[PDB]
Design a protein around this nucleic acid. Structure first.
Ligand code: SF4
Ligand code: CAC
Lengths: 75, 89
DNA sequence: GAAAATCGGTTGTGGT
DNA sequence: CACCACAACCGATTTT
Protein backbone atom coordinates (compact mmCIF):
# COMPACT_ATOMS: atom_id res chain seq x y z
CA UNK A 1 0.00 0.00 0.00
CA UNK A 2 2.90 2.38 0.88
CA UNK A 3 4.50 1.35 -2.44
CA UNK A 4 1.82 3.27 -4.41
CA UNK A 5 3.31 6.56 -3.21
CA UNK A 6 6.97 5.78 -3.97
CA UNK A 7 8.60 8.46 -6.14
CA UNK A 8 10.17 5.73 -8.31
CA UNK A 9 6.79 4.11 -9.18
CA UNK A 10 7.06 4.42 -13.01
CA UNK A 11 10.73 4.53 -14.08
CA UNK A 12 11.84 0.99 -13.48
CA UNK A 13 14.80 -0.70 -11.85
CA UNK A 14 17.48 0.73 -14.16
CA UNK A 15 18.16 3.36 -11.45
CA UNK A 16 18.07 1.25 -8.25
CA UNK A 17 19.87 -2.00 -9.17
CA UNK A 18 23.34 -2.51 -10.63
CA UNK A 19 23.67 -4.38 -13.93
CA UNK A 20 25.92 -7.45 -13.92
CA UNK A 21 29.50 -6.39 -13.59
CA UNK A 22 29.10 -2.65 -12.92
CA UNK A 23 32.10 -1.34 -10.97
CA UNK A 24 34.05 1.89 -10.36
CA UNK A 25 32.55 5.31 -11.12
CA UNK A 26 29.45 3.99 -12.95
CA UNK A 27 28.49 2.01 -9.85
CA UNK A 28 28.79 4.84 -7.38
CA UNK A 29 27.02 7.40 -9.61
CA UNK A 30 24.07 5.06 -10.16
CA UNK A 31 23.83 4.80 -6.39
CA UNK A 32 23.93 8.60 -5.97
CA UNK A 33 21.21 9.24 -8.57
CA UNK A 34 19.02 6.74 -6.76
CA UNK A 35 19.64 8.25 -3.36
CA UNK A 36 18.87 11.71 -4.64
CA UNK A 37 15.47 10.41 -5.67
CA UNK A 38 14.82 8.74 -2.32
CA UNK A 39 15.65 11.89 -0.36
CA UNK A 40 12.75 13.61 -2.04
CA UNK A 41 10.48 10.63 -1.59
CA UNK A 42 7.38 10.97 0.66
CA UNK A 43 7.55 7.28 1.75
CA UNK A 44 11.33 6.97 2.38
CA UNK A 45 10.66 5.96 5.98
CA UNK A 46 8.28 3.16 5.12
CA UNK A 47 10.64 2.11 2.32
CA UNK A 48 13.63 2.01 4.67
CA UNK A 49 11.99 0.15 7.49
CA UNK A 50 10.51 -2.37 5.04
CA UNK A 51 13.99 -3.10 3.49
CA UNK A 52 15.52 -3.49 6.95
CA UNK A 53 12.59 -5.38 8.47
CA UNK A 54 12.68 -8.04 5.79
CA UNK A 55 16.35 -7.55 4.84
CA UNK A 56 16.06 -6.95 1.06
CA UNK A 57 19.39 -8.26 -0.28
CA UNK A 58 19.61 -6.02 -3.30
CA UNK A 59 18.96 -2.58 -4.66
CA UNK A 60 18.76 0.89 -3.22
CA UNK A 61 15.72 1.08 -0.84
CA UNK A 62 14.70 3.89 1.42
CA UNK A 63 17.79 5.95 0.57
CA UNK A 64 20.19 3.03 1.58
CA UNK A 65 22.62 1.17 -0.69
CA UNK A 66 22.78 -2.63 -0.36
CA UNK A 67 26.01 -2.45 1.62
CA UNK A 68 24.69 0.28 3.88
CA UNK A 69 21.86 -2.05 4.90
CA UNK A 70 24.23 -5.00 5.22
CA UNK A 71 26.22 -2.81 7.57
CA UNK A 72 23.13 -1.67 9.61
CA UNK A 73 21.82 -5.20 10.12
CA UNK A 74 24.85 -7.49 10.68
CA UNK A 75 24.89 -8.74 14.33
CA UNK B 1 -12.68 -14.69 -13.94
CA UNK B 2 -10.32 -15.24 -16.89
CA UNK B 3 -8.18 -12.28 -15.79
CA UNK B 4 -5.39 -14.91 -15.71
CA UNK B 5 -4.68 -14.00 -19.36
CA UNK B 6 -3.88 -10.36 -18.61
CA UNK B 7 -1.92 -11.35 -15.49
CA UNK B 8 0.31 -13.43 -17.80
CA UNK B 9 0.47 -10.48 -20.21
CA UNK B 10 1.74 -8.09 -17.54
CA UNK B 11 4.00 -10.78 -16.09
CA UNK B 12 5.64 -11.54 -19.43
CA UNK B 13 5.84 -7.71 -19.31
CA UNK B 14 7.68 -7.27 -15.99
CA UNK B 15 9.98 -10.24 -16.71
CA UNK B 16 11.04 -8.50 -19.95
CA UNK B 17 12.87 -5.80 -18.00
CA UNK B 18 15.06 -8.13 -15.90
CA UNK B 19 18.38 -9.12 -17.44
CA UNK B 20 18.45 -12.10 -19.83
CA UNK B 21 19.98 -14.29 -17.14
CA UNK B 22 17.59 -13.11 -14.45
CA UNK B 23 14.63 -13.79 -16.69
CA UNK B 24 15.91 -17.22 -17.76
CA UNK B 25 16.35 -18.32 -14.15
CA UNK B 26 12.85 -17.30 -13.07
CA UNK B 27 11.51 -18.94 -16.20
CA UNK B 28 13.36 -22.19 -15.62
CA UNK B 29 12.56 -22.22 -11.90
CA UNK B 30 8.85 -21.74 -12.27
CA UNK B 31 8.54 -23.60 -15.59
CA UNK B 32 7.14 -20.66 -17.57
CA UNK B 33 9.05 -22.24 -20.47
CA UNK B 34 7.64 -25.81 -20.86
CA UNK B 35 5.49 -26.13 -17.69
CA UNK B 36 8.13 -28.09 -15.69
CA UNK B 37 9.99 -26.42 -12.79
CA UNK B 38 13.69 -27.11 -12.68
CA UNK B 39 15.81 -27.59 -9.57
CA UNK B 40 18.57 -25.18 -8.65
CA UNK B 41 21.07 -27.73 -9.89
CA UNK B 42 19.53 -28.08 -13.40
CA UNK B 43 19.60 -24.30 -13.70
CA UNK B 44 23.31 -24.22 -12.58
CA UNK B 45 24.03 -26.72 -15.38
CA UNK B 46 22.32 -24.52 -17.92
CA UNK B 47 24.21 -21.37 -16.86
CA UNK B 48 27.52 -23.19 -16.00
CA UNK B 49 27.38 -21.94 -12.40
CA UNK B 50 26.94 -23.57 -9.01
CA UNK B 51 23.50 -23.86 -7.32
CA UNK B 52 24.61 -21.25 -4.82
CA UNK B 53 25.17 -18.72 -7.58
CA UNK B 54 21.69 -19.53 -8.92
CA UNK B 55 20.22 -18.79 -5.46
CA UNK B 56 22.02 -15.35 -5.39
CA UNK B 57 20.71 -14.48 -8.85
CA UNK B 58 17.17 -15.63 -7.83
CA UNK B 59 17.41 -13.41 -4.73
CA UNK B 60 18.43 -10.34 -6.66
CA UNK B 61 15.50 -10.94 -9.01
CA UNK B 62 13.06 -11.24 -6.10
CA UNK B 63 14.44 -7.99 -4.80
CA UNK B 64 13.83 -6.35 -8.21
CA UNK B 65 10.27 -7.67 -8.50
CA UNK B 66 9.28 -6.49 -5.05
CA UNK B 67 10.88 -3.05 -5.45
CA UNK B 68 8.37 -0.15 -5.66
CA UNK B 69 9.93 0.99 -8.96
CA UNK B 70 8.15 -1.79 -10.88
CA UNK B 71 5.92 -4.06 -8.74
CA UNK B 72 2.40 -3.15 -10.05
CA UNK B 73 0.99 -6.76 -9.75
CA UNK B 74 -0.24 -6.69 -6.15
CA UNK B 75 -3.87 -7.24 -7.37
CA UNK B 76 -3.89 -11.04 -6.63
CA UNK B 77 -2.53 -24.28 -8.32
CA UNK B 78 -0.63 -22.81 -11.28
CA UNK B 79 2.99 -21.64 -11.99
CA UNK B 80 2.15 -17.94 -12.41
CA UNK B 81 0.45 -17.94 -9.00
CA UNK B 82 3.42 -19.88 -7.71
CA UNK B 83 5.68 -17.04 -8.93
CA UNK B 84 3.35 -14.35 -7.60
CA UNK B 85 3.14 -15.90 -4.11
CA UNK B 86 6.90 -16.41 -4.23
CA UNK B 87 7.35 -12.65 -4.68
CA UNK B 88 5.05 -11.45 -1.90
CA UNK B 89 5.46 -14.51 0.39
C1' DG C 1 20.04 -19.28 6.42
C1' DA C 2 24.27 -17.57 5.24
C1' DA C 3 29.67 -15.80 5.19
C1' DA C 4 34.24 -16.21 3.87
C1' DA C 5 37.50 -17.58 0.36
C1' DT C 6 38.98 -17.44 -4.10
C1' DC C 7 38.47 -16.49 -9.14
C1' DG C 8 38.69 -13.65 -12.89
C1' DG C 9 37.04 -9.45 -15.79
C1' DT C 10 37.90 -4.36 -15.59
C1' DT C 11 40.51 -0.47 -15.31
C1' DG C 12 44.37 2.28 -15.63
C1' DT C 13 49.09 2.71 -16.90
C1' DG C 14 52.57 2.21 -20.14
C1' DG C 15 54.85 -0.27 -23.83
C1' DT C 16 55.30 -1.42 -29.40
C1' DC D 1 43.47 2.93 -33.26
C1' DA D 2 45.58 -1.92 -32.53
C1' DC D 3 48.08 -5.40 -29.55
C1' DC D 4 50.44 -6.42 -25.34
C1' DA D 5 51.65 -6.80 -20.31
C1' DC D 6 50.71 -6.56 -15.74
C1' DA D 7 48.86 -4.98 -10.74
C1' DA D 8 45.41 -3.52 -8.25
C1' DC D 9 40.80 -3.81 -7.68
C1' DC D 10 36.65 -5.62 -6.45
C1' DG D 11 32.29 -7.89 -8.42
C1' DA D 12 31.30 -12.68 -9.57
C1' DT D 13 31.44 -17.01 -8.24
C1' DT D 14 32.87 -20.99 -5.45
C1' DT D 15 33.59 -23.17 -1.05
C1' DT D 16 32.55 -23.73 3.77
S1 SF4 E 1 12.48 5.39 -0.98
FE1 SF4 E 1 13.45 5.35 -2.82
S2 SF4 E 1 13.08 3.38 -3.33
FE2 SF4 E 1 11.85 3.54 -1.65
S3 SF4 E 1 10.07 4.30 -2.68
FE3 SF4 E 1 10.94 6.13 -2.35
S4 SF4 E 1 12.10 6.44 -4.11
FE4 SF4 E 1 11.40 4.41 -4.32
C1 CAC F 1 33.81 -21.32 -16.16
AS1 CAC F 1 31.87 -21.45 -15.84
C2 CAC F 1 30.87 -20.24 -17.03
O1 CAC F 1 31.35 -23.09 -16.16
O2 CAC F 1 31.52 -20.97 -14.19
Amino acid sequence: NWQLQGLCRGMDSSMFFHPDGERGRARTQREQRAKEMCRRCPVIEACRSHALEVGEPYGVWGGLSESERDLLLKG
Amino acid sequence: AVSFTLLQDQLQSVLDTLSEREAGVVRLRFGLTDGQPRTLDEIGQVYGVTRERIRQIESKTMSKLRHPSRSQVLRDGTPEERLLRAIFG
